[PDB]
């Protein structure tokens, strides 16, 4: 299928550049034009500019001149985008997308799953992990995960298996610090009598921690 | 540059019924009869979806329940029947002219029946106050309306300092919302106090520090 995969999130510091990448699948490359847009964290979304592969040919958005450039690599089929003399408003999440001819309104048909890029002086911090059990005919059990930097963290119960009941919050920034919670309600007869286990990623700080949500 | 403009922000909908939502530019999108506004949902965390091209036309995969209408600058999105995993932002867009713009988006939320939150509070872990830190923690879960009022208690006193509250979006199956509210004390002012309080407004849930 046709499909655009975009490289990971990155933190770089301002001032600092940075080239995020876009790799096409399941087309030919050169034929078709490759967007990116901008999506701050609560907001909407911007056009930055759009190379056509074959012959490398640009249009930008004059907003972002000298902000950006945009590359191709026909072999690989990979895109890039490079960001210069970052600010802290070049925080967002960046995405690629291919877009179609004027028979189709010249639309974006496909996306790549967007690129987080946090420019920030302050410093990766991993997570602290704290299990939440009852103070103590279904039970709620948690999991705080606090005071990380950056974002994202990934947290799962029991590796993943146990998906329904779950509800994972969006994080809260304090002092240069993100703090999450994610909840998940069992029945009864499935917990202590059976474990549950929060299991949380913090790929920037190169953490993964397992606490088992142990009765009080 | 072309300025889209949506209307309105936010919308909310009943299971069923029709959600209609406008985009006006500032200058003609389209050219020889063909459009060049496009229309696209996008679910929390993913890229945008194509809904609409060229003003009218279904995308791939597209369900009849989307249409659009409009030309030169007066455009429109319908979606009928209202589905539950409907509840998504929507955003128009432009391609007629370098650059391309999209519109400021609209929130389109599902209406349903409201519902009470089911309320669990938590002490402090241990490890946490072997650390010197005391996070007492209140969830609120599958709750309609969004809007909800969480207060803090301790020792029978409204305690409004160190709370932080984070809400989920829109639950695409059944149409509720919950939302976390964690205090933050020392663990020299956790040990302080016995009773610790959370209310939703009401729905009351507590323990005692023992």
């Known amino acids: 299928q046709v499909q655009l995969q975009q490289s990971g999130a990155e933190l770089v510091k301002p001032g600092a550049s940075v080239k995020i990448s876009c790799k096409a699948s399941?087309?030919?490359?050169?034929?078709?034009?490759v967007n990116w847009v901008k999506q701050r964290p609560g907001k909407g979304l911007e056009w930055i500019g759009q190379?056509?592969?074959?012959?490398?040919?640009?249009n930008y958005n004059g907003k972002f001149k000298g902000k950006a450039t945009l590359t191709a690599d026909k072999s690989s089929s990979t895109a890039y985008m490079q960001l210069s003399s970052l600010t802290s408003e070049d925080s967002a999440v960046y995405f690629c997308?291919?877009?179609?001819?004027?028979?189709?309104?010249?639309?974006?048909?496909?996306w790549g799953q967007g690129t987080t890029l946090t420019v920030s002086s302050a410093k990766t911090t991993p997570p602290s992990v704290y299990p939440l059990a009852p103070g103590s005919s279904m039970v709620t059990l948690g999991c705080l995960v606090k005071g990380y930097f950056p974002e994202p963290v990934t947290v799962t119960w029991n590796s993943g298996s146990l998906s329904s009941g779950v509800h994972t919050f969006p994080a809260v920034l304090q002092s240069d610090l993100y703090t999450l919670s994610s909840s998940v309600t069992v029945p009864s007869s499935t917990w202590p009598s059976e474990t549950v286990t929060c299991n949380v990623a913090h790929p920037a700080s190169s953490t993964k921690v397992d606490k088992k949500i142990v009765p009080r | 540059d072309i300025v889209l403009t949506q209307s309105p922000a936010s919308l909310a909908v009943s299971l069923g019924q029709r959600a209609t939502i406008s985009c006006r530019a500032s200058?003609?999108?389209?050219?020889?009869?063909?459009?060049?506004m496009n229309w696209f949902q996008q679910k929390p965390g993913q890229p945008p979806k194509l809904l609409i091209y060229?003003?009218?036309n279904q995308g791939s995969g597209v369900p009849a329940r989307f249409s659009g209408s409009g030309s030169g600058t007066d455009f429109s999105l319908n979606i009928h029947p209202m589905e539950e995993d409907d509840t998504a932002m929507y955003f128009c867009?432009?391609?007629?002219?370098?650059?391309?713009?999209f519109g400021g988006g609209t929130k389109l939320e599902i209406k349903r029946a409201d519902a009470a939150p089911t309320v669990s509070i938590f002490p402090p872990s241990s490890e946490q106050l072997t650390s010197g830190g005391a996070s007492v923690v209140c969830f609120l879960n599958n709750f309609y309306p969004k809007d909800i009022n969480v207060k803090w208690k301790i020792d029978g006193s409204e305690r409004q300092n160190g709370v932080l509250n984070s809400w989920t979006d829109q639950d695409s199956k059944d149409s509720t919302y919950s939302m976390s509210s964690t205090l933050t004390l020392t663990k020299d002012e956790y040990e302080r106090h016995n009773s610790y309080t959370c209310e939703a407004t009401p729905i009351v849930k507590s323990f005692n520090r023992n």
């Open positions: 997308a291919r877009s179609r001819g004027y028979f189709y309104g010249s639309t974006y048909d496909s």
């Open positions: 399941g087309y030919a490359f050169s034929s078709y034009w």
């Open positions: 190379i056509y592969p074959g012959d490398g040919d640009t």
């Open positions: 200058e003609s999108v389209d050219n020889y009869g063909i459009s060049f």
């Open positions: 060229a003003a009218s």
């Open positions: 867009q432009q391609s007629k002219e370098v650059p391309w713009t």
